[PDB]
């Protein structure tokens, strides 16, 4: 018996013996809740065999292009996101697509851009944390370029 596998032959066998004579299904239905793959049993005479396999393979692509038109040497703000409370008694934090930019112009062509930006999120509006307040997935970059 191993563990890297979805379920243990223990819970399965016990459940099958507990499901006999119109038994319960809670126990076994709780094992098979998150299982994902191909569990293939085989009986050749007396040796039982259980084969487990799943490959999870994933893909995501994100692309945000928040533009804004500002006067030189005034800081613009630009937000498209949201105010969620955080503990500290609570507090409001604007987490979404933010661009805060104060451009500064070289006489001729080239812009000095002071950027503070991030793409941040409160994970799931219906999901908790191992901590105490909300958490945020952020992608930030504050630099002058």
């Amino acid at each position: 018996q191993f563990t890297n596998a979805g379920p243990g032959i223990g819970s399965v066998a016990i459940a099958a013996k507990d499901y006999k004579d119109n038994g319960t299904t809670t126990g076994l239905a709780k094992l098979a809740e998150n299982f994902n793959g191909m569990a293939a049993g085989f009986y050749q005479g007396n040796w039982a065999m259980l084969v487990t396999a799943l490959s999870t393979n994933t893909k995501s692509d994100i692309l945000s292009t928040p533009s804004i038109v500002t006067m030189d040497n005034k800081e613009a703000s630009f937000n498209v996101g949201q105010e969620v409370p955080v503990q500290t008694t609570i507090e409001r934090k604007t987490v979404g697509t933010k661009l805060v930019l104060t451009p500064q112009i070289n006489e001729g062509d080239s812009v000095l851009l002071t950027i503070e930006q991030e793409v941040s999120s409160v994970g799931k509006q219906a999901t908790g944390t191992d901590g105490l307040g909300p958490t945020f997935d952020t992608r930030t970059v504050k630099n002058a370029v």
């Binding site: 006067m71 030189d72 005034k74």
Partner: peptide
């Protein structure tokens, strides 16, 4: 705004920086 502080040393002549046009007015 940043240059004003720098130049204030050199003066320390009367300076201010306009945040808008980002220009330095010295006398």
């Amino acid at each position: 705004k940043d240059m004003v502080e720098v130049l204030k040393g050199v003066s320390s002549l009367a300076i201010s920086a306009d945040e808008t046009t980002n220009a330095l007015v010295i006398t």
